[model samples]
Each structure stands twice: as C-alpha cells, then as structure tokens.
Target chain A: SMMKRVHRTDVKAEIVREPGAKETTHRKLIDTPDGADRFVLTEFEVSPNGSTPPHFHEWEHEIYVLEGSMGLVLPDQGRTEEVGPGEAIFIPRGEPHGFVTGPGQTCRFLVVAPCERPPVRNVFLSEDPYEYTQMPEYTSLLE
Target chain B: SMMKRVHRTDVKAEIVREPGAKETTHRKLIDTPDGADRFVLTEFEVSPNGSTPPHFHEWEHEIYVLEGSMGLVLPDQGRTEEVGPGEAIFIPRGEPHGFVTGPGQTCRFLVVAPCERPPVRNVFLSEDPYEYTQMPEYTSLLE
Candidate 1:
C-alpha cells in the first residue's frame, strides 16, 4: 500500500518500436521495482511524420489524446480518423490498428492496459521491437 | 481541445452499484462519452461503512486513497488492510476482496482501471453475486 506522484522529471522518455514506425513512451507504473500485479500506464509521443506499428492487440486498449492531433488508420473500419485533444477512444482486444502524428506537428497521448507479459525491470530494457512496413495504397495518405 | 480546471462545483457524482450491497459509488470520468475506446480518468468516493459485496475481479484494480481510511478485507488472505490518505493499492483481478469503513469514517479513493466494465457509465451489473454472509454484520451496525 503506497502512493506515488510522478512528474516529468520522474519519468524517462524512450523510443517506441512499432510494426511501421517509431515513437516515445513514458512509463510510470510498470517501471516500479516492487513487481506488483497491476495495470500498465504509458504516455506515447510521436514526432511529426512518426507513427506506431501496424498490428493487432491481444488485450483491450484505451487511448486518450493529451496534446496535438493524432491520425488513426483503423483496418476493420477502412477509414482514416483524426482525433484531437480532450477526446478518448477505446479499441477492443485483437483489433488491427495504428496511429500517426498529423503533418507539421507532434502527437502525445496516454495508453493504458492490463497485464505485462514480462514485468518491466529496467523498464528501458523491455522496449517493444517494432518492425516497420511499407504504407499500403489505402493506408497511405496523400500529402 | 478544451482545457480548464474543474472545481468542486463543476463536478457531479453518479452512483456505482454492485449486485448486493447498500454501499454506493459516485464518479466522474475524463473520457468515454462516445467511442470504441477510452483514455479515462476518474474520481470515486465510497460512503461510510459502504463497501463492495465480497467480490473478485478478472482484471487489475489500482486504487488511490483520497480522504479517509478505506478498510479492505481479504478473505482468502485472512487479513484486513486500511488504506489512508496518500496511499495506493494494486489488487489484481481474481483476488477475493471487499471493504468496510475505517474507525467510524467515510472512505474516499481514486480508482484507475484499464477496462470499461468498471468505469462510471458502464457498470458490471453482475448476475453472479457474491455471498451475503456479512449482510447482517453491516445491517446490525447501521441500525
């Protein structure tokens, strides 16, 4: 039973690897050394022209936009949506999806989910190995 | 796209109901008015002597103690713990648990869960209720 307040100084920013792109993650919970059974909370920031990997999740995911506009490409819906600040989105388990930063700006948001396969010890060492993929015709944007 | 400080007057409390307890809940969320996902943040308060009907969950529950002491009874562990101001408890899903008040006080806490079932708008409304062995215990105390 403990309470912790995390500030920007307390969190370390690291690169995020996705199937198609790269971003940064600020982990606040799983990084704790106590090794508790709990949820994982992270802040992902995508640089201008950056995005996340294309893949399906085995568990549910919740995405909240904190800063800037985020461009999303949902495979099942076959459409492109741009979510702005103060908006929240829910992606059910096993949905193929990906996100990118809007042109001329960066994007930042929070990601939360339950169960971390291998509990993060160093936190930095356990980064995801995102494999990049070429943007398909329908998935690509006309800029 | 809108950012402003929400004062006490700006807040509204909604009741969160469990299957079989007099204890109720009040909450406010930052996400999830409409969508497939939520990047939700919420504040929940539990009344004096109010608690969940001994229940176990399937996902992790992360709680932050806000006001008074929140007492928790872990039947399987044969222990009762009190979480007071500035403390957080991480209870994984599937852990047999419930709570009662602390030393004649109403308890308040901040709960963060990654799923919608436990959030404010979406209640679990379980058909499989927990045993009511302690009904008399609380009933007698209130009377």
Candidate 2:
C-alpha cells in the first residue's frame, strides 16, 4: 500500500550538507515513481554570501522561499529579483538564473520540478554546475 | 519553449493570507504545454482557524508548507495531524483529507497538481457531503 505518513516540521528542517558549501542544504522527501518522470521536489538552503552559478533547469521549476532573503540574478533577461520569507517564484525550463543568499542570514526555498531526467546542468558551459547528483534513497524526492 | 520566467516576489515578509479560505489571498503559476497535467503550481494562504473541508482528488496532490501550521484531517482515520512550514506532504488520488489552520498564524503552502480541476474541498460535515463541494480555479488564487 502506498499510504502516506505525516512528517513533522522538525523532520523537514533537517538539511543535507554538501561538500564545500556552507549553509546550503538540500532534502528530497519523496521519490519519483518509475516511468512517471513528471515531477520532483527538493528543499534548498544557502548561508550568508553564498551564491550559485548561473544555470537553468531543463524543466519547469517552482521556487517557494521559506525563510531569509536571497538575491537572484537573471542575466538572460537582464533582471535581478530578491525574494524572502513566504514568497513563491516560478522558473521555467532553460533560463540563466542563480542565487546569492542575503548578506548575513541564510536562505531556504522549496524547488519543484516537473521532470524526471531534469538536466542538472548544460555540460556545454560549466562541467561542475550543480552539486553532487546521485543522492541516497531517503533524500530522493520522487514517487 | 523551455524558457524561464520570474514570478512576483519582491517582498520580504510572512504571507498572512489563505488561498481558498474566507478573506485570504492565493497565488497561481501555471506552466504552458509542459506535460500531462504537467505545468501547474499554486500557493494558498489559509487563514488562521480556516478550514478546507474533506474531498478526494483525481490526480495526485503534493503540498509544501511555506509558513505557519495546519492540520490534515482524514475521514477514515478519524484523526488529524499538524503540519507546518518546511514540511512536505502528499495526498494520493481519491483520499479524504482536508486542512485546518493553526491558531493565530496564517497557513501557507504550495500545491502541485495536474488535473484541470485544481483542488476541491468539502468544508462542512454532513451526511451528504457532496452538496457542500467547492471547486477553486487557478485565477481565483490571486483574487
């Protein structure tokens, strides 16, 4: 049976620390079902002064900023937008955008993608675009 | 086209509105021609003490709480669990689950569902629950 369980807030706040990145944590709650290839969700965190290289998702990605401010740079359209607590943003597939956390505080946001084989990065520009790709089962946000 | 667009998030404050409740504000961002029931993203601001009544869904319903806390009361289980910001929750097809906001704070969450029906709820407890059914649209989220 595919019965869903109730996971509390304390359990959700647990962050997955990546190598060499401070204040940036990602947690994938559900795993995608086989052949669905339709959607995925992940929680991303960034510490003060942290910035991500400008890259875009191959599929539609939704952003819901939970806590703290984050600076976003959209060079493709020559625009920059700063989002904070309780604000949600939408980033379609294949656009150049990235983030830099607030000056002193950390930034957290939930990202939802409607694709299974979502391009982590365009190998054309940067080899090391997104952080570690293969995550364990518990962190897989599908199914 | 797999293009990316930024959404309306220039503020840095807690969202105190509910999407499908009395006097609450909701936000919707729909993806275009992306995939099957593929391109839909919405956020709801459920007012404090507000309730989203019992109802089942055709497509899957996934939610991520962005602010405040709320409860998911199930008809079969006869019990409710409290959910808050940062937590990710999922409701499968044809399940009877509804929302009950926590005290004093607005309950905010993002929803990803494919069907054109958006989301529906049965707010009142009645033997003939279908009579009280209410279906919300994407455009109504911002209004």
Candidate 3:
C-alpha cells in the first residue's frame, strides 16, 4: 500500500492486565494486519496509578511520550525516570522495566519494537504475571 | 545500553531546508549510532508555512505526532490529509509524499524508518530539489 492513516483514538483499545496494575489498554497500530514489515507500532494508555509490572522482552523497544507524564521503571536497579512529553526513551532487550502513572493523571505513549503480534512475549522475574489473568497485549503508561 | 532518555529539547536540531518551504528542523533520537537496530527514529519540526516538498524513499517509515498538527500530502494522488496528535501514518517505499504546516503554527512528529545514517536515499519526482541547496535528513511537519 502507498499510504495509510490510523486514527488510533477511534480504534478499540485492548484491555491488558499485568499483575499489580490497575488498568492497561493497548491498541495495535501497525503490524502484518496493517501490511507493515520489520517492526510493529503500538499505542498504549495506562490509567492513573496503573503499571505494567516488571518484565523483559526478547526484543528491544523505543517509546515516545505523547500525553501527560510517565515514569519508566527499572526494578532490577530500582531507578525510575520521570519522562514527559517531547522526550524519547530506549529500552534494550532482556532488560527489566515497567511503567507507572500517578494519581489523577494518565500516560499515553507509542512503542516501536521488533515486529510481533499484540501482547508481545514477555519474561517476568517472577512467575508469569499474566497467568490466568485476562491479558490482551502488554502495555502501560508511566508517571 | 539498557536504557537511555533523550530530552529532545536539549539536543541539537538540524536546520533542514527543502524547496519552496520556509524552515524545517530535525533531531535524530535513535539509530545505529544510538545502538538501536531495525529502525531509526527521528524528530522533525517544521515552521509555519514550512513544507518538505515532494519526494520518495527506497524504504518505508511510520510517523507519530507529538505536538501541534500537520498535513500529510500525497502529491501523486492530489490528496492532503490533516493529521494531528494521536494519529499515525504509514508511508510505503516509492510513494511520493510531503508534509505541510500552516501559518503561525509549527508541527512536530517522529519518523521511524528503516535504520540508516539518514538523509536516506530520495528519488524525487523531478530534478533533485536539493541540488546545490542545503538539506538535512528529509523531514517536514504537516498542518
């Protein structure tokens, strides 16, 4: 296809549940379904006081903050970086990370990662957080 | 690197000038130089009345709006789509396209294309517009 535009807000947001998070929603923006190759693009929204829990991926991803603010968390290092609009972030493969949003403020971001279907495979430090829990695709916003 | 954060505002923006346009600026956020693989991510800023003219690439890229609004132009189709934050666009290789911003309003967006040392190859519809002119990596903000 020569061109395609997606009004992400007009699409359905997947209800994702990562343990310890109040609410997480994800929208698969680009993938095989969209005729994209090499990488997949996704939009994520984390409700206030929400999180994605600690997890790692076999692939790496970069994020661009769109609305409000978010905190990128590194549980292994116990360090959290408060990222706001106009700031971009890089997370390498096999590194443990999570997202957090503070009270009354939600965080939304776009994740560009190696191509894959929704709910990209994740490796948790502990037991699988999504075990038996309704998980669509892993996505969370940071404070 | 496991993690890195770039406050794009703190980085240098290249002064990019395309034909028949006022002003365009860009900041490469992630690429091979930044230890990223698969795709290169860059931020672009176009001044009011700025446009990238018309051009095509050998590879495709997706875009996400961060601040302000832009118009995505498909010169070959004679159609211009006004896109704003929360919208994403996909442009395939060889598809001639451009970006335009209106008066008194600048547009900013991130372009994620197949990774390269940028100013990626461009096949213009006509003579090289960059001929004997200053141009940085191809970028523009749509209004």
Q: Pick the candidate with the highest DockQ.
A: 3
Rank order by lDDT, top first?
3, 2, 1
lDDT of 1 at A70: 65
Model 2 local distance difference test score: 0.57
Against the reference, the lDDT scores of all candidates come to 0.54, 0.57, 0.71
Q: Give per-residue CA lDDT, model 2, range A41-73, as digits (tens).
A: 677888886755555665666676777877766
As for TM-score, the candidate ahead, 2 or 3, is 3
lDDT of 1 by residue, B22-126 (tens): 455655544544232433456666676566666665555665455677667665555566667645465665665666763367876555664345422112234
**Fnat measured on candidate 3:** 0.70
In order, what DockQ does each candidate have?
0.08, 0.25, 0.62
Q: Which residues of candidate 2, in runs, are more than 4 Å off? A: A1-23, A33-37, A102-105, A123-143, B1-25, B29-37, B101-106, B118-143
Task: List, in order, the clash count of every candidate structure.
Answer: 9, 13, 11
TM-score (C-alpha, index-matched) for candidate 2 = 0.66
Task: Give the residue spans of candidate 3 off by over 4 A.
Answer: A17-21, A117-143, B17-22, B117-143
Best model number under lDDT: 3
User: How good is the docking of model 1, as DockQ?
Assistant: 0.08
| DockQ class, candidate 3 | medium
